[PDB]
Amino acid sequence: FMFVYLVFLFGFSTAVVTLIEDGKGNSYNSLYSTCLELFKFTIGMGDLEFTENYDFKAVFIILLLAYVILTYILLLNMLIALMGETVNKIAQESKNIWKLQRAITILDTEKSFLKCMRKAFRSGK
Amino acid sequence: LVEVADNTVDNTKFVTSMYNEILILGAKLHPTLKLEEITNRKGLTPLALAASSGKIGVLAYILQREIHEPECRHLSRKFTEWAYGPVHSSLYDLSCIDTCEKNSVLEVIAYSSSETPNRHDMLLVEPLNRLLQDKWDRFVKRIFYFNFFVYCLYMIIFTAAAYYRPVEGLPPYKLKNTVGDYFRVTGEILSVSGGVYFFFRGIQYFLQRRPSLKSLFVDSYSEILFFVQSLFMLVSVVLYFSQRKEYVASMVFSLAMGWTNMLYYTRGFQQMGIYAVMIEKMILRDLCRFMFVYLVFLFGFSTAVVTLIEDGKGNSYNSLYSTCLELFKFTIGMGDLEFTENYDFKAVFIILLLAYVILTYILLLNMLIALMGETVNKIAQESKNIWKLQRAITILDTEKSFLKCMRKAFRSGKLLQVGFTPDGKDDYRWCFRVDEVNWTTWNTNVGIINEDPGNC
Numbered sequence: 279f280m281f282v283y284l285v286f287l288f289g290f291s292t293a294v295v296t297l298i299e300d301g302k303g304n305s306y307n308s309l310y311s312t313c314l315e316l317f318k319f320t321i322g323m324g325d326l327e328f329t330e331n332y333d334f335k336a337v338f339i340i341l342l343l344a345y346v347i348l349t350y351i352l353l354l355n356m357l358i359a360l361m362g363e364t365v366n367k368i369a370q371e372s373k374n375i376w377k378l379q380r381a382i383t384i385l386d387t388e389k390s391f392l393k394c395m396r397k398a399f400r401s402g403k
Numbered sequence: 404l405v406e407v408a409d410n411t412v413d414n415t416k417f418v419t420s421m422y423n424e425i426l427i428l429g430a431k432l433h434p435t436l437k438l439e440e441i442t443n444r445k446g447l448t449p450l451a452l453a454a455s456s457g458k459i460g461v462l463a464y465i466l467q468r469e470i471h472e473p474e475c476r477h478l479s480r481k482f483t484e485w486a487y488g489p490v491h492s493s494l495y496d497l498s499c500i501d502t503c504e505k506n507s508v509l510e511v512i513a514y515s516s517s518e519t520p521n522r523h524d525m526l527l528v529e530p531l532n533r534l535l536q537d538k539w540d541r542f543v544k545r546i547f548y549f550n551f552f553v554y555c556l557y558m559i560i561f562t563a564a565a566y567y568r569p570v571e572g573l574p575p576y577k578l579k580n581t582v583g584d585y586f587r588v589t590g591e592i593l594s595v596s597g598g599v600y601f602f603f604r605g606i607q608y609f610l611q612r613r614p615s616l617k618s619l620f621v622d623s624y625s626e627i628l629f630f631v632q633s634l635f636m637l638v639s640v641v642l643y644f645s646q647r648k649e650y651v652a653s654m655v656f657s658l659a660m661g662w663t664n665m666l667y668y669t670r671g672f673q674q675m676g677i678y679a680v681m682i683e684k685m686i687l688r689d690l691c692r693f694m695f696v697y698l699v700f701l702f703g704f705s706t707a708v709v710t711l712i713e714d715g716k717g718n719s720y721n722s723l724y725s726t727c728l729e730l731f732k733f734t735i736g737m738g739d740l741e742f743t744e745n746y747d748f749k750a751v752f753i754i755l756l757l758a759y760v761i762l763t764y765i766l767l768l769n770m771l772i773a774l775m776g777e778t779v780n781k782i783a784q785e786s787k788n789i790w791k792l793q794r795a796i797t798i799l800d801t802e803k804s805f806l807k808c809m810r811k812a813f814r815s816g817k818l819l820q821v822g823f824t825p826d827g828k829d830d831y832r833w834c835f836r837v838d839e840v841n842w843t844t845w846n847t848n849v850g851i852i853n854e855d856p857g858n859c
């Protein structure tokens with residue numbers, strides 16, 4: 279998700295930045311600032327009129343709506359769906375991997391405390 | 404017989420059985436005649452006809468046909484080169500499959516019109532899948548990576564050139580002796596060259612593939628996207644040299660669309676390719692349906708609210724566009740419930756806003772999430788098959804483009820002797836070799852070609 283989302287974000291940020299003229303927050307003619315402004319849309323804090331320093335309002339608004347539809351309405355919900363599928367798929371493998379993690383912890387702990395009890399805690403009889 | 408097949412189990416079984424029986428009888432009666440080479444008016448053969456019509460069972464039978472009858476064994480297309488223990492080495496014929504013919508099976512399957520029933524599944528038959536993987540591994544993967552790298556460089560140059568555009572006056576802008584100006588001009592020239600290149604490539608694709616109207620709409624998405632990006636670039640150039648300042652809009656659209664098109668190159672990797680296929684399916688189905696319903700609701704409530712507002716006594720919210728934008732802000736989590744006060748009845752206004760919020764925000768969006776979940780659950784395997792088709796098309800296009808560099812240097816399989824023709828001459832075929840292991844069989848009495856098991 280992050281690979282695809284970063285591709286989209288950078289493309290639309292570059293487009294919007296080149297559209298902005300900044301003539302006539304301030305000085306939005308910065309790649310970092312526009313990238314942050316577009317990222318704000320993902321976290322539910324996006325402003326659709328964060329600047330007016332452009333010559334063509336229709337192009338600006340069309341770009342913003344295209345970005346919002348592509349990343350907010352499609353990619354995030356699709357990520358939720360893919361997460362649901364993954365949860366469904368890995369029910370038992372997770373338990374097995376946890377068992378391995380605990381086994382590694384057991385072995386490491388037993389190796390560390392050889393001096394305290396080299397063979398005092400030996401399994402079986 | 405091929406025309407009668409319809410992919411059902413009993414129909415497929417009998418069609419294959421009768422095909423084999425008639426082939427054997429023809430071989431016995433007229434050993435000289437080669438039945439399977441005869442063609443109909445369209446020029447197709449039984450194998451090509453089966454491949455094009457989408458008859459998967461007949462194709463699978465034909466490609467793996469194995470006849471052990473000693474008198475008529477040259478008819479076989481699969482042979483056992485050797486066996487030592489549980490290990491077998493088999494050969495596949497590749498006679499009319501390796502894209503070295505007028506219209507091979509592989510090309511026919513790859514360039515289908517999507518009207519054929521199950522073209523997605525016809526590449527899972529063993530020889531075709533292994534052959535495509537071999538071709539990908541041998542030479543085409545490096546070419547694909549090179550193309551991806553060149554496209555990345557092109558997009559970086561285009562972005563850099565567009566970022567530093569002049570802002571004073573009207574185009575065209577006079578050159579200056581500054582080194583940065585020379586770099587900018589070089590970048591602009593390279594961007595225009597790339598645009599025209601993509602334009603001509605789209606044109607030649609349309610000419611060669613002669614896609615049908617419905618096929619043009621439903622099959623060639625990436626081609627159309629690249630062509631539209633090139634069109635935007637060319638329109639931008641035209642406006643730039645016409646002294647209009649609107650070329651910036653076209654240039655920006657081209658820039659954004661090219662950066663998005665960068666996603667095309669994820670089909671060289673399995674995971675990302677399948678992810679992109681799922682993205683395409685979601686866009687086609689769920690986004691379309693949801694957007695239709697959502698736009699209907701949004702327009703209805705926007706008109707209602709706008710007519711309620713009087714704007715007498717942000718400002719001047721008595722505009723359809725402004726109210727539509729204000730209501731759209733609710734969807735992205737930025738809606739203001741008191742964005743205006745220029746009205747007479749507060750109960751009506753607030754009731755309308757709450758009805759819209761409940762209908763579109765609490766119901767439609769979560770329902771879209773649920774529908775996406777269902778779609779993801781449904782299309783697990785079809786996505787992989789579609790990615791396989793995409794990679795196969797890439798392989799075929801790459802192999803066609805580089806005929807001059809290596810017309811037949813990279814040819815799959817190798818020429819091997821399989822047996823003897825009934826006339827007594829040698830049987831030489833361009834075979835593709837596979838290896839297999841079987842523990843249950845333990846068959847020590849079969850037909851083999853080579854006494855010594857190993858290969859060199």
Ligand code: NA
Binds near residue numbers: 321322323735736
């Ligand atoms: Na919010």
